[PDB]
Design a protein around this ligand. Structure first.
Ligand SMILES: NC(=O)C1=CN([C@@H]2O[C@H](COP(=O)(O)OP(=O)(O)OC[C@H]3O[C@@H](n4cnc5c(N)ncnc54)[C@H](O)[C@@H]3O)[C@@H](O)[C@H]2O)C=CC1
Ligand SMILES: NC(=O)C1=CN([C@@H]2O[C@H](COP(=O)(O)OP(=O)(O)OC[C@H]3O[C@@H](n4cnc5c(N)ncnc54)[C@H](O)[C@@H]3O)[C@@H](O)[C@H]2O)C=CC1
Ligand SMILES: NC(=O)C1=CN([C@@H]2O[C@H](COP(=O)(O)OP(=O)(O)OC[C@H]3O[C@@H](n4cnc5c(N)ncnc54)[C@H](O)[C@@H]3O)[C@@H](O)[C@H]2O)C=CC1
Ligand SMILES: NC(=O)C1=CN([C@@H]2O[C@H](COP(=O)(O)OP(=O)(O)OC[C@H]3O[C@@H](n4cnc5c(N)ncnc54)[C@H](O)[C@@H]3O)[C@@H](O)[C@H]2O)C=CC1
Ligand SMILES: O=C(O)C1SCCS1
Ligand SMILES: O=C(O)C1SCCS1
Ligand SMILES: O=C(O)C1SCCS1
Ligand SMILES: O=C(O)C1SCCS1
Lengths: 279, 280, 278, 281
């Protein structure tokens, strides 16, 4: 009953996932969302159009429509966008940057040249908001009101987990839960290949592997136990599971997942350093 | 609005799986805890103490469980199954459906033991996993020689209340064991390691565990609810030149995919090997 | 393109591949093509002569002859070429650089010293244009007219896939489809060795492996499905294919192909940095 | 072409291969979809749906497919073949050509089953692949003891309509399985990974997939049309000091060639071992 108007600058995968999640949650009407993109011939744009989201090529129209304005363009596009519509940001706006790596400081520096106290929030979310099981963190900017952070948390909690963090954690969150779903999709493809190798039909192997991962993740979320203790409860002495865990260990399975989180976090920091030098 | 008002369930064995299934069934509301009985020779077990708190009836005597129950879950270690069947075989009656949850143990071996006492024992073999405790298990089952059509439908109805459940041919169950039976342990290992990675890059451990588990849960749900290939969903996360595709490369460089294939294979092979030792 | 005259500065592998492709496509007459090289005794020069292309040692003759001018020399030779013929570029010319790494900016700066508004196109293609199955991208320069891009796409679409890109994608394209045929030739040699190890005659193993790769690539191009889904359709449970896919995975096969695209792209960027520093 | 004038074709099994062959045969125009019949127990498959839309006649009864067809393709999983041969063996007649597509299954095992019913079953063993669906398959076949001369000629003409086809001795078919039978899956894996490499270096995924597939198709076509060795063609791409030779080094450092040899070998060996388990049983 808030009747919030939401805009997305950028009408790609994340704008679609968030719009789909918000509308499935019943927090927003699809036609109260407006998204802009210069390439109005993407599949994401077509899917947004079918949902009933309003679409325009003009970023200024998205700004003027919006109360909450999500920045959902590639990180290197954010400064061009802030130059373009910075004069259109109003005191009523909450600007939510979803761009990987882009700092609140960089955004406020651009926008403060126009109005003195732009309300900026930075978030890192992930594509599972599309099924309302996202993992979201956010940090509040210099001029964001206490009510702004609470509004953001309410909105993003409707599509998954949401919590406030200090901004200096967000690049690490990006490497864990931002990139996380891609590690899981890779793992599920491989587990299914394993099931197929041992004689299962592919359709059944995909379903079983995905259900196994979902159930295990839910167990851990609902348990106060260490993941190692939960692992111990699966493995009977001499049994099949502990034999399988040994071959994972012999390949350095754990180290590969640590490598992945690190690589994603470092690349996030490295891109932003490139961005800050280009300014 | 499901409820089996005339069904008494028993567990021979009162360990991790018996607890998980009993907790799942009671949370589902399809069974009252007092209609469940579990037996174990060790009544000083953490799982036994937990089943007590739920209201499950406990006894040291497997014969008591058999006499109380209609649906009888065998939830003991695989090498104990033949001793259990020798012990209570004379107590199996026409009304009993015997559901073996033991990894690897064949319908054939169970029916041969029980048929020495009374012909036509109704046997079902199932492979489930511990997430039935949060009603997100993955279960397959195969029906035995003398199981009636209504027996398998009833068991699918019961096991569907605590997660995914489908009928399979028995010769797929050892492979299912390697995938979704052992799968939760692969996930717990992966979540421990992902959290270590989060901590390495500066996150508090509690938050890293929560975010990693939420990421895995959400991705699995996305795939279950999508008609798209996991590779296509992966492509939607990875923007060109971005952080995710850099991370995917280092996974590939370590043969990440091959390790998970190795694991499913190793668990399946061990399951087959253990049963061959049992039958020899 | 009946009135169109095409020239190649540099008469080596790529010039032959494009001229053979163009003439087999019927979009160009061989006698309307001229190519120049210093060493008129190269094997590519002789093959070009056999198909009816006009040949000359003088790059200025090529320029005076043609409307569309392909630069098909090694990348470090481009600046020397642009200095030699810059004064002969006219308003009618479309200069198409095929050189790996070389930027539109560097070409326009050299040519603009002689005449303002040179019409420049940068492209990255590959050798399979010789069988009209090339993969080509192009970027239009500052002063290229809109019809210039449409003309180049029409011409290069006759010898394979062709699409316009932003210039900052071209170094990555170079690592993928520019170098890609070499990855495929390596893979085909190895697959044939595998067939021979298992008892096939070499000639048959080469033919079968190449047919397999061609068919699979065509399947993917004509399908809406993800390559992973097509892989799923081949491998039956417990079967020979999924066993072989495992051994590829155990060697990090996917990671090696990622390494290759990366290494070729990085080397391309590195070489242009040395050119721009010089 | 009088071979196909009035010929009817049947598929026992209605999965990926049956759809790929039926699609290729009809696209080639060598066969009308209504002259093709397929049978499968579970009509709940996706491939059974597509075959319906093509105009292919479907039925659950394998005996009906046998009665309809002159050329009978066996397109079921290898371990089902002896069960199928028990079921329809008394229905195989003199006029049938039985074409086994099952991996590993020997002409000998098929002829042993069918010869218990009628003395001279005409059997052909083939190994094809899924790109017949785009008429670019790679097919080999071996002729059985009782296959007539025109039988192999008929088979060759039919399978040549959807790609390369040549006759081989049967002892080569397990190795062909490891090379061109499994080969498309190696290519699909390689294209997925090449596209990941394009994406890592900044390309949109859609363009990376298109460029990688076009590169592989073009290189394969080049080799098929050239008399030159693959290494000489590789040499023509690599300029001294250039990007390609740098990329080839990193492939070599990972043993890229050996992985592909490993794959052909592993598929060939699994094919041999599947059959040895079948004939022991
Ligand atoms: N996809 C994911 O998994 C997640 C993405 N993100 C972040 O969200 C942002 C976008 O992510 P995707 O949606 O995956 O990118 P995407 O590339 O799918 O969509 C990007 C959109 O930006 C549009 N665009 C380009 N220039 C524009 C301009 N000048 N004005 C307006 N729109 C313009 C493009 O047309 C495209 O529609 C990135 O910053 C990424 O870091 C963060 C968390 C997860
Ligand atoms: N824990 C898991 O992840 C799953 C286990 N299973 C199967 O379930 C069965 C049990 O698994 P867990 O519960 O993990 O074992 P567990 O070891 O936690 O509990 C085993 C129970 O058997 C009891 N027991 C030993 N001898 C007995 C006897 N003579 N009579 C009665 N009870 C006796 C023990 O006291 C204990 O309560 C095994 O066969 C295993 O393969 C299958 C799927 C998943
Ligand atoms: N071979 C390939 O796979 C592809 C090559 N390219 C690019 O095309 C260009 C050439 O490729 P290749 O034809 O393989 O080189 P190549 O070395 O086969 O032929 C190069 C030609 O340049 C000639 N040349 C040298 N100095 C000259 C001068 N001062 N004036 C006129 N001609 C001169 C040489 O005599 C030779 O004929 C390079 O820039 C390369 O990056 C791009 C894509 C694919
Ligand atoms: N898909 C491929 O890449 C190629 C497959 N092959 C061979 O072709 C055969 C099947 O290939 P796919 O089509 O991939 O198998 P698939 O499993 O996709 O379809 C197999 C068909 O057999 C049917 N079937 C099972 N039992 C049956 C019965 N009793 N009567 C009639 N139909 C029955 C199934 O319903 C299914 O339609 C296998 O032997 C395989 O080795 C060989 C070359 C390539
Ligand atoms: O504990 C074990 O190893 C068996 S029970 C879970 C899957 S296999
Ligand atoms: O493009 C990317 O990889 C960013 S968006 C998802 C997490 S990081
Ligand atoms: O699917 C399989 O593994 C067999 S059928 C294609 C070649 S081998
Ligand atoms: O020869 C080379 O390495 C360059 S030109 C073709 C791809 S990159």
């Amino acid at each position: 009953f808030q009747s919030m108007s939401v805009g997305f600058i950028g009408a790609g995968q994340l704008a679609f996932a968030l719009a789909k999640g918000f509308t499935a949650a019943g927090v927003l009407a699809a036609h109260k969302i407006m998204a802009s993109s210069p390439d109005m011939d993407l599949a994401t744009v077509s899917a947004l159009r079918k949902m009933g989201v309003k679409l325009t090529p003009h970023n200024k129209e998205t700004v003027q429509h919006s109360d909450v304005l999500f920045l959902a363009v590639k990180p290197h596009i954010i400064p061009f966008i802030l130059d373009e519509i910075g004069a259109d940001i109003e005191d009523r706006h909450i600007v939510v940057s979803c761009a990987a790596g882009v700092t609140i400081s960089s955004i406020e520096k651009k926008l403060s040249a126009f109005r003195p106290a732009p309300r900026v929030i930075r978030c890192m979310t992930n594509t599972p908001v599309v099924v309302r099981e996202g993992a979201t963190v956010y940090a509040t900017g210099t001029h964001a009101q206490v009510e702004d952070g609470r509004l953001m948390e309410q909105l993003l909690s409707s599509v998954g987990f949401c919590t406030e963090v200090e901004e200096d954690l967000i690049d690490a969150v990006t490497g864990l839960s931002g990139s996380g779903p891609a590690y899981a999709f890779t793992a599920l493809d491989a587990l299914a290949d394993g099931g197929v190798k041992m004689g299962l039909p592919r359709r059944l192997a995909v379903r079983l592997g995905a259900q196994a991962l979902l159930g295990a993740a839910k167990m851990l979320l609902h348990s106060e136990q260490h993941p190692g203790q939960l692992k111990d409860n699966v493995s009977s002495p001499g049994g099949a599971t502990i034999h399988a865990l040994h071959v994972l260990e012999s390949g350095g399975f754990r180290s590969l997942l640590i490598n992945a989180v690190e690589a994603s976090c470092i690349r996030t920091r490295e891109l932003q350093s490139m961005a800050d030098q280009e300014q």
